[PDB]
Amino acid sequence: TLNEDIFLKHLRERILVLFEGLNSIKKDDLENRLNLTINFLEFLLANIEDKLKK
Ligand SMILES: [Mg+2]
């Protein structure tokens, strides 16, 4: 069963690597979208405050 053990252990590692890559990709995409929304809200806040000082 040696060949079986090698294939299964490598397959486990491949699954873990796939999960690690998927989580990295999702984290980057989430960071991008969060930065967009946060910048939008900061621009809105700054514009509102500039509109209030006048
Ligand atoms: Mg790993």
UniProtKB/Swiss-Prot annotation:
Annotated motif MKD, positions: 26-36
**Reported consequences of knocking out the gene:** Deletion mutant is motile and binds to host cells. It shows a reduction in host cell invasion, induces significantly less IL-8 than the wild-type and has reduced MAP kinase signaling. Mutant is also deficient in maximal phosphorylation of cortactin at the ERK-1/2 phosphorylation sites and in stimulating membrane ruffling. Mutant exhibits reduced virulence in a mouse model of campylobacteriosis.
Q: What are the subcellular locations of this protein?
A: Secreted; Host cytoplasm, Host cytosol
Specify the superkingdom: Bacteria
Any idea what job this protein has?
Effector protein required for the development of acute disease and colon inflammatory lesions. Required for maximal host cell invasion and maximal secretion of the inflammatory chemokine interleukin-8 (IL-8) from host cells. Acts by activating the host MAP kinase signaling pathways ERK-1/2 and p38 to promote both cellular invasion and the release of IL-8. CiaD mediated activation of ERK-1/2 leads to the phosphorylation of host cortactin (CTTN) on serine residues and association of cortactin with N-WASP, promoting actin cytoskeleton rearrangement, membrane ruffling and host cell invasion.
State how it assembles.
Interacts with the host cell protein IQGAP1, thus displacing RACGAP1 from the IQGAP1 complex.
Present the record's domain note. The Mitogen-activated protein (MAP) kinase-docking motif (MKD) is necessary for cellular invasion and IL-8 secretion. Interaction with IQGAP1 is independent of the MKD motif.
The name of this protein is Campylobacter invasion antigen D
Organism encoding this protein: Campylobacter jejuni subsp. jejuni serotype O:2 (strain ATCC 700819 / NCTC 11168)
Q: What is the lineage of its organism?
A: Bacteria, Pseudomonadati, Campylobacterota, Epsilonproteobacteria, Campylobacterales
In terms of the parent sequence, the fragment covers 110 to 163 of 163
